[PDB]
Design a protein around this ligand. Structure first.
Ligand code: MG
Ligand code: MG
Ligand code: MG
Ligand code: MG
Ligand code: MG
Ligand code: MG
Ligand code: MG
Ligand code: MG
Ligand code: MG
Ligand code: MG
Lengths: 87, 13, 213, 52, 224
RNA sequence: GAUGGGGAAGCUCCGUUUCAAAGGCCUGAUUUUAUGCAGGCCACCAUCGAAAGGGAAUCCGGUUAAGAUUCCGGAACCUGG
RNA sequence: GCUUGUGACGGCCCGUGAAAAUCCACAGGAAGGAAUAGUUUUCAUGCCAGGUCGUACUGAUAACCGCAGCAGGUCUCCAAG
RNA sequence: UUGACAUUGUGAAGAGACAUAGUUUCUUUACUUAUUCAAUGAAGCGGAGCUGGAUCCACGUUCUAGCAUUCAAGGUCCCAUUCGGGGCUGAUCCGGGUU
């Protein structure tokens, strides 16, 4: 097995920032916030913030990556897209 | 239990 | 008949240049706004030998005007340029050895090298060791400059074309006898496969038209 | 170098590691003297502009 | 405030790094953008024959607004209310309809048979040969026409995306006077006003730099 | 040696970053017009090509008919989390 | 003394004698962080894991090529008195 | 290598024919818009400044192997002061041509 890269596993994969979550969901920020409220997705705090954010100490909101992945399968998102088309 | 299409949900939280 | 080497050389193959150990193509800076309107200062970091080229090369570091970083340029070193020297390139540069100036900004009798044939090609004339170009005269109405080339020819070129003040370093190289087929071998090993040469008369008539007898 | 502590790869000085002590001393001297000369040149040119 | 100081930046040559500036003039655009822009520029630069150049003279803003205000009262029946009408005829077993006539072949036939009271021709028709003969045909048949800006506007008139032509043939008795007044207005503002200027070649326009060079050369010639 | 392109009747040829809309990242309650994503940043090109070039880190003892820095016993080291 | 590795030097060139992956350091300071409690996983110790393929033997006057168990040909390491 | 035709456009000046109202042929001289060559990070091109100094210049860079990067500090209008947030300027304007 070859040498593994850093900032790929552990805290780097467990958490996802809000901008990355919005980009992955391909929605707007307002839709993201409303979906998080509806589904009960809440921000979390890693015990190693520099490991989670590649050495930055800047304040960042983190979510569970698996929570975002589960959020990807919500039909209310499809309803939001249908409303955009109707508008 | 197993997937049929390449994109699935299968409803486990 | 058969194909002679004169015709075989055009296919490339074993007649391409030996360019592994080269330092890089020797060119002036791209003619940008700074050199068009004012000047820019670089620093000579080192003077190095280029394999296959008689003249030495100079590494000159400038600052990127649009981004925080350094840009390295490979110049052909003029005689008298030393490491640590400040080099000024542009229209407002002073008349000192090593500086890069437009041809229209120098007086008659000025000696230059690495002269652009057209403004922007980044140096084409008087690049070999010991060679230089003399500024014969100016024609401001046509915005042209008459120069004398190393071969003795006289050329008319744009006054926006650039040149480096001075003469190419490494002169007097061809005044020393090689004395040895080995020295010729090592000379051409770093350039190209054009050595040794067999006389056409020494060949058969099929190989060369001069052959036979 | 990734297996040793930072103490083995640096010395306790500005540019410690990358630059040696004499080079650091010379660049400190050059920076100070050139900034002072820049102040002098600015004053001289500003006075000369009015005097001309 | 003793803690803050003024630190001006020198943005001259050989000085501090240049700041961000608007470089929209130097953008390397996508090839389709470059093609459509250069096509428009070339159409401006070349000498345009009169039968194409006549399509640059259209109705003015007020007259066009009045024309479309008249035509939107005769916008054709949609598919939704056609089903309503067809069910009303089934129970009975309908008055005469009034609508804007559209479709290029249909309108050309109406013009040739002298049934069209008014004809509207879109100016942005590609290929232009589809309507380049229409003003001459209308003039020879004695039918009032008007060149208008927007095949999309005519499309909104006829419930389509685009329409090359629209025509008014039959009008109600409440709007016959308005139609006659509109015809007289278009005759005064479009037919009579642009009668001479439509006979000239268009697009004799130099570029910005060439124009400046020509003006500088003329100034240098006239005055030393 | 593909792609973007350009040649060739065509099998295919050129070329290897150009001639391409060639993709990643940050911030947001964007003064809200009320269930429609806004403001910015940075930039150059696939892939293949060395069991003698570059390259993370292991040793000793014992053991078999035939294995061995790989097994057994003991003692280490590297990489990632 | 022999072999080998290494150091500081000296001679030679119209010959001045690879690239990249990869690792570290510096400059900078977006920021974050303590009083009855913080910080530091570049100090030590403690926890977990490390897939696939090759691995026998000959390497030659008999295990390779030369129609052969052919006086031919075929790269290299160690080396006692 | 030489010549013809097509690609092939727009002006002005001087000569020809309708017998001294502009429809075309022949020379001269311009222009750009087709076509062609080159470069770039398609960054500073062209014109103008009741811009300043003295027709020309940016008077924003020349003893020195230093440094120059976080929407730029400052000035000035607002905000609802609160960790700070916006606007003009700093860095002139216009263009339908990347050079
Ligand atoms: Mg012979
Ligand atoms: Mg190929
Ligand atoms: Mg490979
Ligand atoms: Mg190896
Ligand atoms: Mg064995
Ligand atoms: Mg073991
Ligand atoms: Mg073995
Ligand atoms: Mg063996
Ligand atoms: Mg055999
Ligand atoms: Mg055989």
């Amino acid at each position: 097995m070859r040498i593994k890269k850093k900032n790929t596993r552990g805290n780097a994969r467990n958490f996802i920032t809000r901008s990355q979550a919005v980009r992955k969901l391909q929605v707007s920020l307002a839709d993201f916030r409303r979906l998080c409220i509806f589904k009960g997705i809440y921000p979390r705090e890693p015990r190693n913030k520099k490991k989670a954010n590649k050495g930055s100490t800047a304040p960042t909101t983190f979510y569970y990556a698996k929570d975002i992945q589960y959020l990807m399968h919500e039909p209310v998102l499809a309803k939001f897209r249908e409303h955009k088309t109707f508008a | 239990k197993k997937s049929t299409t390449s994109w699935s949900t299968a409803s486990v939280r | 008949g058969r194909v002679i080497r004169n015709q075989r050389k055009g296919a490339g193959s074993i007649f391409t240049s030996h360019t592994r150990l080269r330092q890089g193509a020797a060119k002036l800076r791209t003619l940008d706004y700074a050199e068009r309107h004012g000047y820019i200062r670089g620093i000579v970091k080192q003077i190095v030998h280029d394999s296959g080229r008689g003249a030495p090369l100079a590494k000159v570091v400038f600052r990127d005007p649009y981004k925080y970083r350094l840009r390295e340029e490979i110049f052909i070193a003029n005689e008298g340029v030393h490491t640590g020297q400040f080099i000024y390139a542009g229209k407002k540069a002073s008349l000192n050895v090593g500086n890069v100036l437009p041809l229209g900004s120098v007086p008659e009798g000025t000696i230059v090298s690495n002269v652009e044939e057209k403004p922007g090609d980044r140096g084409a004339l008087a690049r070999a060791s010991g060679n230089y170009v003399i500024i014969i005269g100016h024609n401001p109405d046509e915005n042209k400059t008459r120069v004398r080339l190393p071969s003795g020819a006289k050329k008319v070129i744009s006054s926006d074309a650039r040149g480096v003040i001075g003469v190419i370093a490494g002169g007097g190289r061809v005044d020393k006898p090689l004395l040895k087929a080995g020295r010729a071998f090592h000379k051409y090993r770093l350039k190209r496969n054009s050595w040794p040469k067999t006389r056409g008369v020494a060949m058969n008539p099929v190989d060369h038209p001069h052959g036979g007898g | 170098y990734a297996t040793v502590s930072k103490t083995h790869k640096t010395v306790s000085r500005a540019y410690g590691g990358s630059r040696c002590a004499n080079c650091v001393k010379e660049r400190i001297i050059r920076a100070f003297l050139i900034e002072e000369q820049k102040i002098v040149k600015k004053v001289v040119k500003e006075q000369t502009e009015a005097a001309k | 405030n003793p803690l803050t100081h003024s630190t001006p930046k020198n943005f001259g040559i050989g000085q501090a790094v240049q700041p961000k500036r608007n470089l929209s003039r130097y953008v390397k655009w996508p090839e389709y953008v470059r093609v459509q822009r250069q096509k428009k520029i070339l159409s401006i630069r070349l000498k345009v024959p009169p039968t194409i150049a006549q399509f640059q003279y259209t109705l003015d803003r007020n007259t066009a607004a009045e024309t479309f205000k008249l035509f939107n009262k005769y916008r054709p029946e949609t598919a939704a209310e056609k089903k309503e009408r067809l069910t009303k005829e089934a129970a009975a077993v309908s008055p005469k309809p009034y609508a804007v006539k559209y479709g290029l072949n249909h309108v050309v036939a109406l013009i040739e048979n002298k049934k069209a009271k008014l004809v509207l021709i879109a100016n942005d028709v590609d290929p232009i040969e589809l309507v380049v003969f229409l003003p001459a045909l209308c003039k020879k048949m004695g039918v009032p026409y008007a060149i208008v800006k927007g095949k999309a506007r005519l499309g909104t008139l006829v419930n389509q995306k685009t329409s090359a032509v629209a025509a008014l043939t039959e009008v109600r008795a409440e709007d016959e006077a308005a139609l006659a007044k509109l015809v007289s207005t278009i005759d005064a503002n479009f037919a009579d006003k642009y009668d001479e200027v439509k006979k000239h070649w268009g697009g004799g326009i130099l570029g910005n730099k060439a124009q400046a060079k020509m003006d500088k050369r003329a100034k240098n010639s006239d005055s030393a």
